[PDB]
Every structure is written in structure tokens, then in C-alpha cells.
Ligand binder design. Sequence first.
Ligand code: GSH
Lengths: 234, 242
Amino acid sequence: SRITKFFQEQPLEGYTLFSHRSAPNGFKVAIVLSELGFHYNTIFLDFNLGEHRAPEFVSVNPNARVPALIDHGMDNLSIWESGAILLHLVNKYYKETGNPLLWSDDLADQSQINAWLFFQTSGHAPMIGQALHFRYFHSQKIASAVERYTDEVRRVYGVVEMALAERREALVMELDDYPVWLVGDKLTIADLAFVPWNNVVDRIGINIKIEFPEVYKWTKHMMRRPAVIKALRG
Amino acid sequence: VEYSRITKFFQEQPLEGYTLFSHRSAPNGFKVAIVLSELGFHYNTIFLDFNLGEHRAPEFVSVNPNARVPALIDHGMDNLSIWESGAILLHLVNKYYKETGNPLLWSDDLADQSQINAWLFFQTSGHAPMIGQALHFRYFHSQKIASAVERYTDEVRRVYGVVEMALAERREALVMELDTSRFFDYPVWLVGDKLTIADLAFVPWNNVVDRIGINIKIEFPEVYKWTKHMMRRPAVIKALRG
Ligand SMILES: N[C@@H](CCC(=O)N[C@@H](CS)C(=O)NCC(=O)O)C(=O)O
């Protein structure tokens, strides 16, 4: 219950992140949190000891998974889905700052960003997770099952790859080496949501540098960003 | 592969309003319709013929790069195009909010918005997909894999447990909040003690789970009442029916 008295004298400001030393989705919030300049504690839970299943924590995230973020300033608000946490942070920053950093003050851009973000957490992350399970942890080796998800994951990358190619193509049509982004010709939580998972697809035989050119650049760019490194060391 | 029809659509696009690209067996398609309907937004639905490869129409893969449904076009906003059911809902509730002043199925307070998304993502991230895999192995995979079918059926029963537990707490709340009992059948919601897109998002699928052998009414009491109130609403009925 190391989480108990952590709930009897909580901070007056700042944030407390609930992640795991390997949870890619946990890294999603770290990166965004660092990028926006928010100061935050980080509590790494141990799945094996079942800590993400203990009472005091599912009181924070009923689903009992990571990440989960306590917003101390907002009277210790609890947000749990990584996607929910990102939209909360960029919203929170735009409200305090007046500058849509990693976000957008335009409605059509927000929709396009939410689109790529929902697509990421629902069509990209889950499938990868599934691919990982059948290749490394499922109670039995079943190729058809692994192929299913690795294939789907390639379908997804093909989607983003073609998307980035059109953006590039659009840029290059500037005949009178630049980074490309999914929305608004600017980096947003739409792009950063993919990096944590992009760095792990090799464990399932997907070579981005060889298979997805525009994606390799897109992600080489994000990986070179301090915050992404400044919090990817586990 | 005949999408000569879909191509015609993109040359003569309506002035303003909304067009929805869905399919008669797409729960997520109806999740959109249901909300598009609760907010009073008029719209025409195009049911893409996947068998004819209409979802591969170059014109359609520009609106929705992922060639999947739903997909909503906001003609009013210069034919803008949103493609994730979750992204479509948020578009609607925000659009509705700045155009009326009243956040129907939404919330005007930052906190409540975070809590609504939480459930919303949970529904699009952990609910729909697992139900899609359970359904896949139990019915369409290339071979029988009982362990794969059990794995996903369990996840669906586990996520349902989360919602059920969530709704149970909300009930206990209201109760010991005016009984200082009859109020054991007063409508309850996930956030703000009001119906929101957080709640509605689930109804389309909640009628799909019998196919994987889950009996909500017998196994999820709180969920059962929850879905039944939403099902009695005129706007919901019109949506699922059309
Ligand atoms: N839909 C959630 C997924 C949460 C999730 O599955 N998190 C993983 C870590 S990436 C976890 O908690 N795994 C522990 C387990 O499954 O027991 C999100 O995107 O935040």
C-alpha cells in the first residue's frame, strides 16, 4: 500500500503520473508532460506484484491500467486514458497560456488531431499489443494469430506513411529537408502519440527505416527531441 | 470494385449540413448517428458497399485515410472531414456548444470534459476492439483458436465489470444523497449526473455482445438499466432504426 499515505498529504500543485518502466502509453504522457513544462512526480507500478490492481489505485483508474494522472492543482483530479490525459494537458496549457502548443486553437485542426489520436490509441496501440501477446506471451504459438495483428499494424503504418507522403509532397511543391507533421504543419499530440509505440514494433519484425521511409523521418525527428529522450530511459 | 457512385458524391457536395459514411452493420456507425441525432443535427447516410470496394474510392480515402467507417463530412465547415467515431463525437459536442451555449451530452467545465473523454477513450480503445477480436476468432478467423476466443471474451467481461462497478458507485452516491429504496431505479450516468456522449457511445455495441455469449441483463444489472433508459429515448430510437 505504498500508494496509501501518498493519499493523506497530496501536493498543492503539480502532477503525479502513474506509469510502468515499460508502458509505452505511460511514456506518451511523460513526453507530453515534459514538452509542456509541467512539473510531475512519477510513480512506477509493478504489474507482477499486481499493484495496478490494488484498491487505492483503481480508485484513481477504475480500469486499473496505466497511465493515470492526478491533477493536484485541479483539486487532485484523476484522468486515466492516455488519450484523455493528452487532451487534458494541451487543453490545460491553452487555457493558462493562450498558445495552442502541441494543440490547436482552430476547431477543424482539433478534429483532425483527435482523429489521428483516436486512430492511434484504438487502431495502432491495441493491435501492436495483440501482436506482442501472440508472439511472446500467449499460452500457445499460433502463426495465423500473430500474422493477423502484424499485418494490421502494417496496414496502419501504410495509412500514416501515405498521409505523411502527401504532406511531404505538398511541402516539396515549394520549388522557388524539413520535418513533416500529421496536422497543421506543426508537431502535436497527434504525432507524439505514435513515437513510444514506433520504437517497439521491431520486437514484432517491423523495420520502419526500411518499410516506412516517410515514417522513419517523422519518427527520427520526434526521437531527436529532448523531452522524448529526457523520459524514454525507462 | 465499383465506386462510380461515391465519386459522384464528391463532385456535387451539399452546401452545408452533414453526410455520414457508414454501413448497416457498423455499431460505430450508429454511435455517430445516435449523437448526430440527439443534438438535432440533420444528415444523410451513405452506406458504403464494402463488397464492391467503395471504401477504396480515391475520393473517399482522402476524406478518411484509413478506409474504415464511420466518417463524417461537415459540409458547413468547408467539407471538413472527421474519421474516428470518437473524434466525430467530440467534434459534434464542441460544435454544438459554441453554436448554442448549452453543452448537450457534453460539459462546459474542464474537469467534467476530462472524465467524459476518459470513458470515451476507454470505449474506443478498450471496449470496441476487444469485442471485435472476440467476435473475430469466435466467427471469422481462418481456424479455430479457443484460447484466442476465451482471451477476448474475458476482456469484454472485464471491461463490462469496470463500467458496472462504475455505475454501481454512482447509484450508491445518489441513494445516500436523498434517503437520509425507491431511488434504486433512478437514472444514473457515468459523469455529471447527466447523459453524455460517454454513456451513449456504448449503446450500439451493448446490443452486439449476445453474439459472444454475454448476457448483460443477467450478468450486468446496472448496465441493463443504464442501456434501457438510453434505448427509450426518441433520438436514439430514430438513429438505430434509420
Ligand atoms: N486504452 C489505454 C490502454 C492502457 C493499457 O493497456 N496500458 C498497459 C501499459 S501500455 C497496461 O496497463 N498493461 C498492464 C496489464 O495489461 O495488466 C490507454 O491508451 O491509456
